[PDB]
Amino acid sequence: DEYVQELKGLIRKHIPERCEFGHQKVTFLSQVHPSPLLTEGFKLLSSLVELESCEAHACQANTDQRFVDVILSDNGILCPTLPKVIPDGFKLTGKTLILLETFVRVNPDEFEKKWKADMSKLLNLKHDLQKSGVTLVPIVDGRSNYNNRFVADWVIERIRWLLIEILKASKSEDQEYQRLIHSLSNVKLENLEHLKRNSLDYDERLNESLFIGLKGDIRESTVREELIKLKLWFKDEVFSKGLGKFKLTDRRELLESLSSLGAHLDSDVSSCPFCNNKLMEIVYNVTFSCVERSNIEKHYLSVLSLCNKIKGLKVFNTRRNTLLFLDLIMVNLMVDISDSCQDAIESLRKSGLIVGQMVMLVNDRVLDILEAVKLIRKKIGTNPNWVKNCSKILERSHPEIWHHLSTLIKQPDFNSLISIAQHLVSDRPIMRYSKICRHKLFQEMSSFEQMRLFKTLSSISLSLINSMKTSFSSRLLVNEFGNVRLRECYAQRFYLAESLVGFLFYQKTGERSRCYSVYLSDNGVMSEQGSFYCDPKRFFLPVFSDEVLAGMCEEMTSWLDFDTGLMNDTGPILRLLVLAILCSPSKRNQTFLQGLRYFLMAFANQIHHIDLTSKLVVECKSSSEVVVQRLAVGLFIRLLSGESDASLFFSRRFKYLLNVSYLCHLITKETPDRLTDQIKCFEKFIEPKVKFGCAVVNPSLNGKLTVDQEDIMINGLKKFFSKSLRDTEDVQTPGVCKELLNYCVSLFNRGKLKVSGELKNNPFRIPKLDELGNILSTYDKEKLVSACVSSMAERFKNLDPDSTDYLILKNLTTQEELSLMYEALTEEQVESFNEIKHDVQVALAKMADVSLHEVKDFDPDVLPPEVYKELCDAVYKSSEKCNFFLEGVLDVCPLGLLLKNLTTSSYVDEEYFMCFKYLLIQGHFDQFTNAALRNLCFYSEDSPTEFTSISSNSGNLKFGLSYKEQVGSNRELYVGDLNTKLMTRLVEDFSEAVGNSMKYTCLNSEKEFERAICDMKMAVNNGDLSCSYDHSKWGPTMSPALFLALLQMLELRTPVDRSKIDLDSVKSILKWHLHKVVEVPINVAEAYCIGSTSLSEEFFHQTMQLNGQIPSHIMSVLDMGQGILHNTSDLYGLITEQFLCYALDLLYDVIPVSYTSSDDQITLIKTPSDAAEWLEMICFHEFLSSKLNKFVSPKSVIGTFVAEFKSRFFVMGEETPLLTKFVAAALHNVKCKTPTQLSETIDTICDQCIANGVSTKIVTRISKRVNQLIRYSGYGETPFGAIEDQDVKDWVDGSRGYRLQRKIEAIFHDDKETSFIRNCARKVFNDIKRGRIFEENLINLIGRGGDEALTGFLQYAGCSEQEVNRVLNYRWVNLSSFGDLRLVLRTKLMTVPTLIKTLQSKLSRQSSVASGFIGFCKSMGSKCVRDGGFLYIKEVYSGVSACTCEICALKPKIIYCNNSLNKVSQFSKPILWDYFSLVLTNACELGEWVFSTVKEPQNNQNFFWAVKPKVVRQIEDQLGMNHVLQSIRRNYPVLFDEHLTPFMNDLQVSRTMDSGRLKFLDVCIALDMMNENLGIISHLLKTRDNSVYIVKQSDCALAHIRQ
Amino acid sequence: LYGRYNCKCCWFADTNLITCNDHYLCLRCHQTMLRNSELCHICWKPLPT
Ligand SMILES: [Mn+2]
Ligand SMILES: [Zn+2]
Ligand SMILES: [Zn+2]
Ligand SMILES: [Zn+2]
Ligand SMILES: [Zn+2]
C-alpha cells in the first residue's frame, strides 16, 4: 500500500466545520478496505462540495435524504401527493420554500445537459405544489471546477490524482470505469474508438434498406450504352408527345400574359391613386392645402420641458395626482400669462401650440380646458390641504431646483379659466374610425407640388416615428365605435409653413399598429385633413429622405434620354410608383416586384420554364396593391411593347426595368406579425413531411423507438429509394433512383469526371429549444426570480421599500439610476418586467406569512380581461373591504402587510384589474451495487460511453425551429443544443476540407468565384449558351440518407498513401443526424390548441388527441435542415452536376462547364458549328436532374443574352449596376450606438455604392441625411461627424482619413493655417525618413495631450510664441473628453482604447431600426456627458459665450476661439492637432502626395469606364500580424500585459524581434491609440474589397488634382 | 477579333451588319444614330460613313 496508506495522511489537512464532516471522516479513516474505500472517498468529496454550495446560500443541508412530502409534513402542511424528489438543500419559511440542487461538471456539454435536466425536474414540482399549497423558488448551483472555500485550492487535485491512481491500480463494470476516470480529469474531436457500437436488431433493416443496390464498381462502356438507350427512349416517348418542361419565348404572348395577370380588369377600383389609399389622400390634402394657401412661446416651451423633466423622477409614488399637479401648474402658468399682454392668448397660442378648447401638457398629451378645471375642482373640499403638502414636498426631500416661484403655490382661479373656455368654443376632433373624384390628375401637375408631396410624406413619417416614442407607463385621466369625441388623446406636432402647423392625434402607446387622425391649424382655425390606420415602425425610410429619392428618380429617368418623348411619359409614372410604394409597405409589393424581375429575365432570354406565369401572380387585398400592380405593369408594357422600333437601345431598357423591379428593397423586411410568421413557418416546414408520409410523433427522446415508429421509418426509407428510370409519373416527389447513382459513383471513382478522389491535406486532423425569439425564456425568468428572492431573504437578518424592484433592473440590464435603467426597455420587455416584479412580490408576501379558474388554468397571473366586461370589474373592486385594504400608502412597506399595501396602491390609481388580481391572490382562491446507488452525487452518468445506430446514450440531436427575415419570403432556421452543434461542426469541417480539395465548387473560395465571373463574362461576350438554374426546395427535400449512400459508395483515396480512408465516424454521425428530433414552437401549439383551412393545422388537430398527445417533437426521414449540412449538400451537388455535364458532353457533343453554390448554379455550354434546336437537351437535363434529388425551379432560364449568378447580372458588353439596391441599403440599417460608428458604417456603404457607378450627386444627399439624423438626436454638429458633403470621384485612392482631411480643409477657406500645419508635417516626415532619424522618444510626447504635443512638434520643426498663440486658438467642443457618453440602448435582455478591442476581435476567432433610433434619441437627452459626475449636453452648450470675435464665425457652432469657452474649458481641444495627426497618418498610409496644394481643372452622363486606385504605400506593404503586438509590448508594457493576450500561446515569435522596428509603424501606432476617431491600424490589416471602380466620365473630369 | 455578331443596340438583328470599329451595328440603328448627331452613343467614337 503505497498510495493507499498515504491517502489517510494527506486527507488529514481537513477542517471539520460541520458535524457531518467529522462523523464521516471518523468512519472513512477508521475503515481500510478497497471495496468500501472508493465509494466513501467519492461521497466525502461530493459532500464537501455540496455542503460548501449549500452554506453559500443560507441553506440547510439535507442530511436525511428525505423527500419533499415528508419535509413538508414535519411542519403543518398537507401533502397533495407530489412526485418523489430528493432535494440537496432546503429552506422553508412561513409559506415559501427554497430548494437548491448542486452538482459539478467539468465540460460544457455535460454542464448544459445536467442543468437542463435538473431545472425541468424542479419546475415540474411547482404546478402540483401550488394547486393546494405554498410557493417555491428553485436554485441550481453548478460549478465547473472542484474548487471551494474550505481548503487552500491545492489539495483537491492531489486527492483526485490519488483516487484515480488507486482506481486504475485495482478494481472491485466495463463502462462504469471508463466514466469515473473521465469525470475526474481536467480537460480533453473525431476517432471516437473508445465507444462500443453495440447492435440493437433494428440497424439490420436500416443497412438492408440503405445498401442493397449500391455497388459502385460499374464499368465505363456499359454506362455509355445505357445512357444512349435512355436518350433514345426519352426522345420518342416523352418529348415528341409534348411532356417537356421548357418552351420558347414568344415575347408577344409573354406581354399578353403580363397584361392579363397584372393589369386587373374585373376590379371595381378606379384609376386614381389618391382615392384608394388613405395615406396618399391625406398627403394630397395637406400638400394642396399648404401649397396654394415672442418670448411667450419660448417661455411656455421652457416651463413645459421643465415639467416634462420633473415628471420623470416619479417622486410621488402615484400617477393620477401627479398629472393633476402638473396640470395645475400648467393652467396656473397660462392664467399668469393671460394677466397682461392681451395679444398673447390669440397671437402666440393660435399660431403657436394650442387647439380648440385644448391645451398641451406633459407627456405629449392634449387636455380639454373644461375637463381640466372640472378635475381641478375635485380633490378640494374633501382634501382641503392638497395644495399645501404638494407645495411643501417640492422643497424638502426634493431636488429644490425649480423656477416655479409663483406658478406652483397659486390657487387656481376658476372664473378666469371659464372665461378662457368661453372665449374659444368646442371644435373637438371626431376620430373617424372604420365617390366624386377631383384630384388634379398627377400626370399634369407642376414640378413643385410633387416635391411638396414628398416633403409632406417625410414630415408625417417623422411624426409617426415620434409617436412611437411616448412613454409606456402612462395612463390617461379618464378612459373611453365609429366616431369618438376626443378630449384626452395624445398628439404630435409638425411645422409646415410660417403660420400653419399639423397635428397628429392618437389614443394608444407602444410599438403596435394604431389609428391616427391628421388635422391642420392655419391661424387657430383647426381644420380636418383625415384619418388612417398604420404601423409606425414601418415608415423610417422617408424620415429625412426627400432629396435622395428625387435625385435617384431623376437620374434613373435621365437614363432614357435616347428618345425625347419616352422619358416624358415614364417620369411621372415612376415618381407616382415610388410614392405609392412608400405610402403602402407590405410583403405583397415586394413579392410582386421580385416576380417582375424574373419575368424580365425570362423575357430577355430565349428558353424558359413552362410554369413561369404561375409564379408571378399575387392575390391582392386591401385594394391598395391593385394600383401599384397596374402602375408597375403599365411601366413594363410602355417600355417593352412595340412592333418593330421597340428595341433601339435595349441595354438602357433592361437596366431601367431591372432597377424598377429592385424597388422592393425600399419596403422594410421586419415581419409584420410574429405569431403569423411563426405559424406560416411551421406550415411550410411540416407540409412536405405529411405529404410524403413519414412524419412520426413524439419519440422517447432517449434513442428507443417502438415497433410502429421503426416500421414507418423503414417504409419511408424504402419509398425514398424506390424510383425507376422509366416511369414519368414521379418527377416532382422526393427520392433518388439507385441505377443512376451507381453510374455516378462508378464513373467518379475511375478518374473520369472533372473532380477526383485525389485529395491532399487529409481531413482527419442556457436557452430552451421550443421557444426561439422570446425576449425572456422560462429558465431565465425563474432564475432571476429565485436570485432576487434569495437575496432579499438573506438580507432580512421586516420591511422593504421599492428598492427591491431596483434589483430587478440591476440583473436584467437612486431615482436617477432607476430612471436611466427603466427607460431602456421595450414594450414587451416592460410587460415581462412587470411579470417578474409581480412574481417576486407575491413570493415575498408568502414569505411574510371566480370559480372558473380552478378547472381552467389555475394561475391567476394570466387571468384574461377579454373573458369579462369592464363595468363588472370596475364595480366589484370598489365593494366593501375591511381587512383586505389598509389606510394610507405606507411608503416604508413593512413585511407582513405587502399585499394590503399593493391592493391600496392599485385601488387609489385608475387601473382596477391589478387590484382585482391582488384580491384574488389575497382571498385564497387558488387552493454493494456500484451502478444504481452511486450515480447521484457527482457521477456524470450521461457521458458518451456506448452508442447505437440512432443515438449516443446522451440524447437524440434535438433542434429548434425558427425563421429568418428576407425581402421576398422568410427563410427557415434551426438552432440546436450544444452536443448536436459539436457533431454538426465535426461533419461540416470534414466536408469543407474535402470540398477545399475539389476545384469547381465556389461557396467558400473567392478565387473560384472570380474565375466563374470571368467565364460568365466571356460567355456573354462571345455568344455561348448560358443556363442559370436555381433549384427549388433544396433544404426541406434533401435527406441525410442520400449523403449516407454517397459516402458509402465513395473511397476518398489518400494523396501519397492510397489507403481508401474508412469513413466510419462520418457515417455514424450521419446516421445520428437521420434520426434527429425537432421541437415545435410553443406559440404554434398554443394557437392551434386555443382556436380558414390549413394542412398543418389539420395535421395538428388530427394528432392532438386522436393518435397520441399534442405534438411537441417531430422526427422524419427527409429534413436536411437549412444551414446545417450546407457543405455536404454542396459536395453532393458538385459530384452530381459533374456527372450530368459528363452525360451532356457524351450525348450532345457540346462543351459544358458548370459552377455551383449549393443552391443555384450556372452552366456555360459551348456548342459546335439558331438556338431553337437545344430544347431537347435542356428537357433531358431537367429530367435527369429530377431523377436525382435536384428538382429545378420555374425561375430558371436558358439563353444567350444575359447571365445571373449570386444576384450579379452580366450582359453584352457591361454589367448592370443595381443602383436602387445600394441606395435602399444606405437609407436602411441605421444602427447607431455612437455617432462615430454610424459615420463609419455609412462611409463603408457609400464607398461600396459609389464603386458601382451610382453618382456623386446622390452620395452627398445621403451624407446630409446622416448629418441631420445626428443633429436631430440632440448631439449637435461636430467637425468630423458623419461623412463629408461636396465630395468628388476621389473615393478612389482615398481612405476615411483622407476624406476627414478634406472636410477639415473645407472648413477653412484660404487654407492658410492648414497649409502651415501641412508644411510642418512634411518637415517632420522628411526628418523621420532620413537625416535626424527619430526613435520612440516622440511616443513620450504623444501620450501627453493635444496642446503640448502640437507645440512640441512646432518647436521641433520651428516656430515661436506667435505660432503658439495663433495655431492653438481654433477650438472645438468634444463631449467625449473624459471618457465616452454613458447610455443604455435598446439591446436584448440579460446583458480603454478601441484599438485594443479591434485586436481582441482579431485574436479571438430581430430589433427594429426605428425603435433603435428612438431609443438613441431618448438616451442622448439625459445626463450623459461625464466629468471629474454627469450632466446634460444643453447644459454644456449653454455655457459657451457668444463672443463673436470674427474668428468664431467662419463656421458657427463648430469652431470657436479660445476665450469663448472660458466657462467650460475642460471640453476644448485644438483642431489643428487632429489635422496634423490625419496628415501624418495619411502619409504613412497612402503616399506623400497628400502634402501638395489642391488645384482645380480648366459628357452625356452615360459614358462609364473602370479605373484603379493609384496609391503608393511607404509602410512595407505586406504588414502582417505579429508586428503591432511587438510594438505595443515595446511602447505600452502595462497595456500589453493587461487587457491583451490572455488568450495567446505563441508569444515566442512575437518576442524574438520578429522584424522589429518597422519603418513608420513605430510612430503611426501611438497616434491611433489616443485619437478616438483616427482608426488606421484597424484599416491596415484589411483588404481593399473593391480593387476597381466603375465611374462615369463626367465625374472624372471635375476632380481635384493634388500632386 | 470583334464581338459576337450582333447590332449591340437591339441584340436581335444579325443580318448584313456594319462595324463601328469596335462592334457590329444594324442597318437601321446606324441611320437613326447618324440622323440624331455625329457621335456614336454606344462606343463614343466617330461613326462610320
Ligand atoms: Mn441563382
Ligand atoms: Zn381621385
Ligand atoms: Zn470668437
Ligand atoms: Zn440594330
Ligand atoms: Zn459604335
Give the SSE map.
The complex is a heterodimer of chains A (1603) and B (49).
Chain A: H1 3-10, H2 19-29, H3 34-55, H4 68-74, E1 89-93, E2 96-104, H5 108-123, H6 126-130, E3 135-143, H7 155-169, H8 176-182, H9 203-210, H10 221-239, E4 246-248, H11 251-261, H12 273-276, H13 278-290, H14 295-310, H15 320-337, E5 358-360, E6 366-368, H16 369-377, H17 386-393, H18 414-423, H19 449-467, E7 490-495, E8 501-506, E9 514-521, E10 526-534, H20 548-558, H21 567-583, H22 587-604, E11 607-609, H23 625-640, H24 650-661, H25 674-692, H26 707-720, H27 738-749, H28 778-795, H29 803-810, H30 815-822, H31 827-848, H32 852-855, H33 870-876, H34 898-908, H35 913-922, E12 958-964, E13 971-974, H36 978-997, H37 1006-1022, E14 1025-1030, H38 1040-1049, H39 1064-1074, E15 1077-1079, H40 1082-1090, H41 1095-1102, E16 1113-1114, H42 1126-1148, E17 1151-1156, E18 1160-1166, H43 1175-1187, E19 1197-1199, E20 1202-1204, E21 1209-1211, H44 1219-1227, H45 1235-1251, H46 1259-1272, H47 1296-1307, H48 1313-1329, H49 1337-1342, H50 1347-1357, H51 1361-1367, E22 1371-1372, H52 1394-1403, H53 1409-1419, E23 1425-1426, E24 1430-1431, H54 1433-1437, E25 1469-1470, H55 1471-1486, ...
Parallel strand pairs in A: 2-3, 12-15
Antiparallel strand pairs in A: 1-2, 4-11, 5-6, 7-8, 8-9, 9-10, 11-19, 12-13, 14-18, 14-19, 15-16, 17-18, 20-21, 22-25, 23-24, 26-27
Chain B: E1 18-19, E2 24-25, H1 29-36
Antiparallel strand pairs in B: 1-2
Manganese (II) ion is lined by residues 1028, 1030, 1160, 1204-1205 of chain A.
